[PDB]
Design an enzyme around this catalytic site. Structure first.
Site, short mmCIF file in Angstrom:
data_model
loop_
_atom_site.label_atom_id
_atom_site.label_comp_id
_atom_site.label_asym_id
_atom_site.label_seq_id
_atom_site.Cartn_x
_atom_site.Cartn_y
_atom_site.Cartn_z
N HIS A 3 0.78 -1.24 0.00
CA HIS A 3 0.00 0.00 0.00
C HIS A 3 0.80 1.28 0.00
CE1 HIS A 3 -3.24 -2.81 0.93
NE2 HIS A 3 -2.62 -3.14 2.07
N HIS B 189 5.56 6.74 6.12
CA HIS B 189 5.23 6.18 4.80
C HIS B 189 4.84 7.38 3.88
CE1 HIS B 189 1.33 6.49 6.89
NE2 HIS B 189 0.88 6.87 5.68
N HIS C 119 2.37 8.99 0.37
CA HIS C 119 1.28 8.79 -0.63
C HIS C 119 1.61 9.64 -1.85
CE1 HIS C 119 -1.44 7.10 2.54
NE2 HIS C 119 -0.75 7.94 3.31
N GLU D 163 -2.75 13.64 -0.17
CA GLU D 163 -4.02 13.24 0.45
C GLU D 163 -4.80 14.47 0.84
OE1 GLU D 163 -3.44 9.74 3.15
OE2 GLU D 163 -4.27 8.85 1.36
N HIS E 209 3.78 10.90 5.63
CA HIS E 209 3.14 10.86 6.97
C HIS E 209 4.00 10.18 7.99
CE1 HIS E 209 -1.07 10.84 4.90
NE2 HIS E 209 -0.59 12.12 5.09
N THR F 138 -6.06 7.12 7.13
CA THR F 138 -6.58 7.28 5.77
C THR F 138 -6.59 5.95 5.03
OG1 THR F 138 -4.42 7.82 4.63
CG2 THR F 138 -5.61 9.71 5.64
#
Ligand SMILES: NS(=O)(=O)c1c(F)c(F)c(S(=O)(=O)CCO)c(N[C@H](c2ccccc2)[C@@H](O)c2ccccc2)c1F
Ligand SMILES: [Zn+2]
Length: 258
Positions: A61, A91, A93, A103, A116, A196
Protein backbone atom coordinates in the site's frame (compact mmCIF):
# COMPACT_ATOMS: atom_id res chain seq x y z
CA UNK A 1 -8.44 -7.30 -0.12
CA UNK A 2 -8.51 -3.47 -0.11
CA UNK A 3 -6.34 -1.30 -2.29
CA UNK A 4 -6.46 1.57 -4.73
CA UNK A 5 -7.60 -0.26 -7.95
CA UNK A 6 -10.97 0.12 -9.58
CA UNK A 7 -12.73 -2.73 -7.70
CA UNK A 8 -11.08 -2.47 -4.29
CA UNK A 9 -10.29 1.29 -4.02
CA UNK A 10 -11.57 4.09 -1.73
CA UNK A 11 -15.20 4.17 -2.95
CA UNK A 12 -15.54 0.49 -2.01
CA UNK A 13 -13.97 0.60 1.37
CA UNK A 14 -17.25 1.20 3.17
CA UNK A 15 -18.41 -2.28 2.01
CA UNK A 16 -15.98 -3.83 4.50
CA UNK A 17 -15.09 -0.92 6.85
CA UNK A 18 -18.33 0.99 7.60
CA UNK A 19 -16.44 3.67 9.57
CA UNK A 20 -15.32 4.86 6.05
CA UNK A 21 -18.53 7.03 6.20
CA UNK A 22 -17.83 8.17 9.85
CA UNK A 23 -17.90 11.75 11.00
CA UNK A 24 -14.20 12.27 11.55
CA UNK A 25 -12.62 10.76 8.39
CA UNK A 26 -9.35 11.93 6.72
CA UNK A 27 -7.89 13.36 4.61
CA UNK A 28 -9.68 16.68 4.10
CA UNK A 29 -9.52 19.88 2.11
CA UNK A 30 -7.99 22.60 4.29
CA UNK A 31 -9.99 25.81 3.50
CA UNK A 32 -7.85 28.60 4.77
CA UNK A 33 -10.76 31.05 4.94
CA UNK A 34 -12.46 28.77 7.51
CA UNK A 35 -9.21 27.90 9.42
CA UNK A 36 -9.20 29.42 12.89
CA UNK A 37 -5.90 30.70 14.39
CA UNK A 38 -5.65 29.47 17.98
CA UNK A 39 -3.08 31.05 20.42
CA UNK A 40 -3.39 28.11 22.77
CA UNK A 41 -1.68 25.95 20.20
CA UNK A 42 1.93 25.26 21.09
CA UNK A 43 4.91 25.03 18.75
CA UNK A 44 5.87 21.54 17.72
CA UNK A 45 8.76 19.98 19.67
CA UNK A 46 10.40 17.07 17.78
CA UNK A 47 13.25 14.80 18.27
CA UNK A 48 13.95 11.92 15.98
CA UNK A 49 17.11 9.71 16.79
CA UNK A 50 18.44 8.51 13.40
CA UNK A 51 19.50 5.20 14.89
CA UNK A 52 15.72 4.66 15.91
CA UNK A 53 14.98 3.47 12.35
CA UNK A 54 15.12 -0.29 11.91
CA UNK A 55 13.67 -1.51 8.53
CA UNK A 56 11.76 -0.47 5.37
CA UNK A 57 9.14 -2.76 3.92
CA UNK A 58 6.61 -2.79 1.10
CA UNK A 59 3.15 -3.19 2.64
CA UNK A 60 1.58 -3.37 -0.85
CA UNK A 61 0.00 0.00 0.00
CA UNK A 62 3.10 2.18 0.44
CA UNK A 63 6.65 1.70 1.81
CA UNK A 64 6.88 1.76 5.63
CA UNK A 65 9.99 2.68 7.55
CA UNK A 66 9.43 1.20 11.10
CA UNK A 67 11.23 2.53 14.21
CA UNK A 68 12.15 1.05 17.62
CA UNK A 69 9.40 2.36 19.89
CA UNK A 70 10.39 1.01 23.34
CA UNK A 71 11.93 4.30 24.59
CA UNK A 72 11.14 8.06 24.33
CA UNK A 73 14.17 8.78 22.06
CA UNK A 74 11.98 9.71 19.05
CA UNK A 75 8.97 11.66 20.11
CA UNK A 76 6.59 14.42 19.19
CA UNK A 77 5.23 16.88 21.78
CA UNK A 78 3.64 20.25 21.83
CA UNK A 79 1.35 21.35 19.02
CA UNK A 80 -2.25 20.46 19.93
CA UNK A 81 -1.00 17.37 21.84
CA UNK A 82 -1.34 16.49 25.53
CA UNK A 83 1.74 14.44 26.59
CA UNK A 84 4.31 12.52 24.59
CA UNK A 85 3.67 10.71 21.24
CA UNK A 86 6.20 8.10 20.31
CA UNK A 87 7.44 7.71 16.67
CA UNK A 88 6.25 4.40 15.06
CA UNK A 89 6.66 4.65 11.34
CA UNK A 90 6.83 6.82 8.19
CA UNK A 91 5.23 6.18 4.80
CA UNK A 92 4.29 8.16 1.63
CA UNK A 93 1.28 8.79 -0.63
CA UNK A 94 1.37 9.76 -4.30
CA UNK A 95 -0.70 9.67 -7.46
CA UNK A 96 -0.23 8.60 -11.08
CA UNK A 97 0.59 12.17 -12.09
CA UNK A 98 3.22 14.43 -10.63
CA UNK A 99 0.79 17.29 -9.91
CA UNK A 100 -1.97 15.41 -8.13
CA UNK A 101 -0.69 13.00 -5.40
CA UNK A 102 -1.29 14.41 -1.94
CA UNK A 103 -4.02 13.24 0.45
CA UNK A 104 -4.80 16.58 2.02
CA UNK A 105 -5.50 19.49 -0.38
CA UNK A 106 -5.19 23.28 0.45
CA UNK A 107 -7.71 25.70 -1.13
CA UNK A 108 -8.15 23.46 -4.18
CA UNK A 109 -4.43 22.68 -4.62
CA UNK A 110 -2.97 19.15 -4.56
CA UNK A 111 0.71 18.60 -4.03
CA UNK A 112 2.88 15.95 -5.74
CA UNK A 113 2.97 13.62 -2.76
CA UNK A 114 2.41 13.62 1.01
CA UNK A 115 4.75 12.10 3.71
CA UNK A 116 3.14 10.86 6.97
CA UNK A 117 5.01 10.39 10.22
CA UNK A 118 2.85 8.25 12.59
CA UNK A 119 3.14 8.50 16.44
CA UNK A 120 1.26 6.98 19.34
CA UNK A 121 0.40 8.12 22.89
CA UNK A 122 2.79 6.13 25.07
CA UNK A 123 1.89 8.27 28.17
CA UNK A 124 -1.56 6.56 28.15
CA UNK A 125 -1.56 3.33 26.14
CA UNK A 126 0.66 0.30 26.21
CA UNK A 127 1.32 -0.06 22.49
CA UNK A 128 0.46 1.44 19.14
CA UNK A 129 -2.32 -1.14 18.58
CA UNK A 130 -4.09 -0.09 21.66
CA UNK A 131 -3.56 3.64 20.94
CA UNK A 132 -5.02 3.24 17.44
CA UNK A 133 -8.48 2.59 18.99
CA UNK A 134 -8.70 5.72 21.15
CA UNK A 135 -9.56 9.30 20.11
CA UNK A 136 -6.35 10.71 21.58
CA UNK A 137 -4.25 7.68 20.64
CA UNK A 138 -2.35 8.65 17.48
CA UNK A 139 -0.77 11.81 16.01
CA UNK A 140 0.27 12.01 12.37
CA UNK A 141 2.51 14.71 10.98
CA UNK A 142 1.84 15.35 7.29
CA UNK A 143 4.44 17.01 5.06
CA UNK A 144 3.66 17.91 1.48
CA UNK A 145 6.10 17.22 -1.38
CA UNK A 146 6.43 19.33 -4.52
CA UNK A 147 8.58 18.68 -7.58
CA UNK A 148 12.02 20.45 -6.88
CA UNK A 149 15.64 19.60 -5.99
CA UNK A 150 16.18 15.89 -4.75
CA UNK A 151 16.28 15.28 -0.98
CA UNK A 152 19.10 12.97 0.10
CA UNK A 153 16.94 11.19 2.69
CA UNK A 154 14.44 10.59 -0.05
CA UNK A 155 17.28 9.12 -2.14
CA UNK A 156 18.19 6.92 0.84
CA UNK A 157 14.58 5.59 0.50
CA UNK A 158 14.44 5.30 -3.27
CA UNK A 159 17.81 3.38 -3.37
CA UNK A 160 16.04 0.54 -1.34
CA UNK A 161 13.00 0.16 -3.57
CA UNK A 162 14.40 -2.42 -5.97
CA UNK A 163 15.08 -4.66 -3.01
CA UNK A 164 11.41 -4.33 -1.75
CA UNK A 165 9.52 -4.38 -5.09
CA UNK A 166 7.06 -7.17 -4.16
CA UNK A 167 4.52 -6.85 -1.34
CA UNK A 168 5.91 -8.20 1.96
CA UNK A 169 9.59 -7.66 1.17
CA UNK A 170 11.72 -5.70 3.65
CA UNK A 171 15.27 -4.66 4.17
CA UNK A 172 17.47 -3.08 6.93
CA UNK A 173 17.06 0.66 7.19
CA UNK A 174 18.76 2.75 9.84
CA UNK A 175 20.75 5.99 10.37
CA UNK A 176 17.71 7.73 8.79
CA UNK A 177 17.70 11.41 9.20
CA UNK A 178 14.01 11.94 9.31
CA UNK A 179 14.25 15.54 10.58
CA UNK A 180 15.76 16.32 7.13
CA UNK A 181 12.39 15.61 5.59
CA UNK A 182 10.70 18.38 7.51
CA UNK A 183 10.60 21.92 6.02
CA UNK A 184 12.39 24.71 7.84
CA UNK A 185 9.05 26.32 8.85
CA UNK A 186 7.06 24.22 11.35
CA UNK A 187 3.87 26.24 10.98
CA UNK A 188 0.86 23.84 10.86
CA UNK A 189 -2.74 23.15 10.62
CA UNK A 190 -4.50 20.70 12.93
CA UNK A 191 -7.82 18.82 13.12
CA UNK A 192 -9.21 15.58 14.57
CA UNK A 193 -9.46 12.75 12.02
CA UNK A 194 -8.75 9.17 11.09
CA UNK A 195 -6.31 6.78 9.52
CA UNK A 196 -6.58 7.28 5.77
CA UNK A 197 -6.30 3.50 5.13
CA UNK A 198 -8.44 0.66 6.39
CA UNK A 199 -9.28 0.17 9.23
CA UNK A 200 -9.93 3.94 9.07
CA UNK A 201 -9.96 4.33 12.84
CA UNK A 202 -10.93 7.75 14.17
CA UNK A 203 -7.96 8.10 16.51
CA UNK A 204 -5.73 10.58 14.79
CA UNK A 205 -4.77 14.11 15.71
CA UNK A 206 -3.60 15.43 12.34
CA UNK A 207 -0.84 18.05 12.18
CA UNK A 208 -0.32 19.12 8.55
CA UNK A 209 2.75 21.36 7.90
CA UNK A 210 2.08 24.36 5.62
CA UNK A 211 5.42 24.40 3.86
CA UNK A 212 6.32 21.65 1.34
CA UNK A 213 9.56 19.94 0.85
CA UNK A 214 11.03 18.99 -2.52
CA UNK A 215 11.32 15.75 -4.45
CA UNK A 216 12.59 15.16 -7.90
CA UNK A 217 10.35 13.76 -10.65
CA UNK A 218 12.82 10.85 -10.92
CA UNK A 219 12.61 10.08 -7.17
CA UNK A 220 8.80 10.32 -7.26
CA UNK A 221 8.49 7.98 -10.21
CA UNK A 222 10.51 5.22 -8.46
CA UNK A 223 7.62 4.76 -5.90
CA UNK A 224 5.15 3.86 -8.71
CA UNK A 225 7.46 0.88 -9.52
CA UNK A 226 6.48 -0.82 -6.22
CA UNK A 227 4.00 -3.66 -6.61
CA UNK A 228 0.77 -4.10 -4.63
CA UNK A 229 1.13 -7.84 -5.31
CA UNK A 230 3.34 -10.57 -3.72
CA UNK A 231 6.21 -12.61 -5.25
CA UNK A 232 4.92 -14.96 -8.02
CA UNK A 233 1.46 -13.31 -8.32
CA UNK A 234 0.44 -11.48 -11.50
CA UNK A 235 2.19 -8.05 -11.12
CA UNK A 236 0.05 -4.99 -10.38
CA UNK A 237 1.77 -1.64 -9.74
CA UNK A 238 1.17 0.84 -6.93
CA UNK A 239 0.91 3.85 -9.25
CA UNK A 240 -1.40 5.81 -6.88
CA UNK A 241 -2.21 5.39 -3.17
CA UNK A 242 -4.07 8.54 -2.04
CA UNK A 243 -7.48 8.65 -0.59
CA UNK A 244 -9.80 11.49 -1.74
CA UNK A 245 -10.74 14.28 0.71
CA UNK A 246 -13.66 13.32 2.98
CA UNK A 247 -16.56 15.39 4.35
CA UNK A 248 -15.48 17.87 7.04
CA UNK A 249 -18.76 17.33 9.02
CA UNK A 250 -18.35 20.60 10.90
CA UNK A 251 -14.86 19.85 12.29
CA UNK A 252 -12.61 22.83 13.22
CA UNK A 253 -9.28 23.13 11.42
CA UNK A 254 -6.92 25.26 13.55
CA UNK A 255 -3.83 27.17 12.49
CA UNK A 256 -0.66 27.62 14.60
CA UNK A 257 0.09 30.80 12.62
CA UNK A 258 -1.54 34.06 11.46
N1 LIG B 1 -2.28 7.46 6.15
S1 LIG B 1 -2.19 6.86 7.73
O1 LIG B 1 -1.29 7.81 8.44
O2 LIG B 1 -3.54 7.09 8.37
C1 LIG B 1 -1.41 5.12 7.46
C2 LIG B 1 -1.14 4.68 6.15
F1 LIG B 1 -1.40 5.35 5.02
C3 LIG B 1 -0.41 3.43 5.87
F2 LIG B 1 -0.14 3.00 4.47
C4 LIG B 1 -0.09 2.63 6.99
S2 LIG B 1 0.81 1.13 6.45
O3 LIG B 1 1.47 0.50 7.71
O4 LIG B 1 1.94 1.88 5.64
C5 LIG B 1 0.06 -0.13 5.38
C6 LIG B 1 -1.46 -0.26 5.60
O5 LIG B 1 -1.54 -0.56 6.96
C7 LIG B 1 -0.38 2.96 8.40
N2 LIG B 1 0.05 2.04 9.59
C8 LIG B 1 -0.48 1.04 10.54
C9 LIG B 1 -0.26 -0.45 10.25
C10 LIG B 1 1.04 -1.00 10.05
C11 LIG B 1 1.22 -2.39 9.75
C12 LIG B 1 0.11 -3.26 9.62
C13 LIG B 1 -1.20 -2.77 9.80
C14 LIG B 1 -1.36 -1.39 10.10
C15 LIG B 1 -1.95 1.11 10.60
O6 LIG B 1 -2.48 0.72 9.36
C16 LIG B 1 -2.54 0.41 11.82
C17 LIG B 1 -1.78 -0.05 12.94
C18 LIG B 1 -2.49 -0.61 14.02
C19 LIG B 1 -3.89 -0.70 14.06
C20 LIG B 1 -4.60 -0.26 12.98
C21 LIG B 1 -3.95 0.25 11.85
C22 LIG B 1 -1.02 4.20 8.50
F3 LIG B 1 -1.31 4.75 9.73
ZN1 LIG C 1 -0.67 8.02 5.33
Amino acid sequence: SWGYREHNGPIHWKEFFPIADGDQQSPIEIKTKEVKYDSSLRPLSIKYDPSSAKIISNSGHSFNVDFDDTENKSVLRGGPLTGSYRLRQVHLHWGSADDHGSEHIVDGVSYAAELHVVHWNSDKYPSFVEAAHEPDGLAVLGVFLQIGEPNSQLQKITDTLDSIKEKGKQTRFTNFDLLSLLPPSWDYWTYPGSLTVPPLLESVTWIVLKQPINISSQQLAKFRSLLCTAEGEAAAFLVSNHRPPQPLKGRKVRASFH
